Design a protein around this nucleic acid. Structure first.
Length: 138
DNA sequence: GCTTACGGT
């Protein structure tokens, strides 16, 4: 079952559709910042004032950081692009030191947890709520 | 795993 990002909670696995606002690969991991244009009280509040001008996403508590490790790194780092849509499945959630909720795709070569992330074609009807809610927001 | 809400690799 899928959840809107508004609905998800830390230390409970979740699946959701989202649009990618930001990517950044590093020597340690691959990070995404994603939104479905629903607000979560535990998300980081992005400032309209100090955010990078490149930030093509919403402000306030409307996006979430996703850390991708290992196999998830290697798969996505030169594949998932900013603006792309994704479905993420049975990902783990946790907080950072300041209490902000984020999600994590950790190593799992045994696939114990049935984790997956895959691109969704822009025209798929599954993305329609995201597109409308963006309207509402914009 | 994670100091970051940057960069453009």
């Amino acid at each position: 079952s899928f959840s809107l990002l508004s609905q998800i909670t830390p230390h409970q696995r979740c699946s959701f559709y989202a649009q990618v606002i930001k990517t950044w690969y590093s020597d340690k991991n691959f990070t995404l910042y994603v939104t479905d244009y629903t607000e979560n009280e535990l998300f980081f509040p992005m400032s309209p004032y100090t955010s990078s001008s490149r930030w093509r996403g919403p402000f306030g508590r409307f996006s979430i950081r996703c850390i991708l490790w290992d196999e998830h790194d290697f798969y996505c780092r030169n594949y998932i692009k900013e603006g792309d849509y994704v479905v993420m499945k049975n990902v783990r959630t946790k907080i950072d030191h300041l209490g902000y909720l984020e999600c994590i795709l950790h190593g799992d070569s045994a696939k114990r947890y049935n984790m997956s992330i895959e691109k969704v074609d822009s025209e798929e009807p599954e993305l329609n709520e995201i597109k409308s809610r963006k309207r509402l927001y914009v």
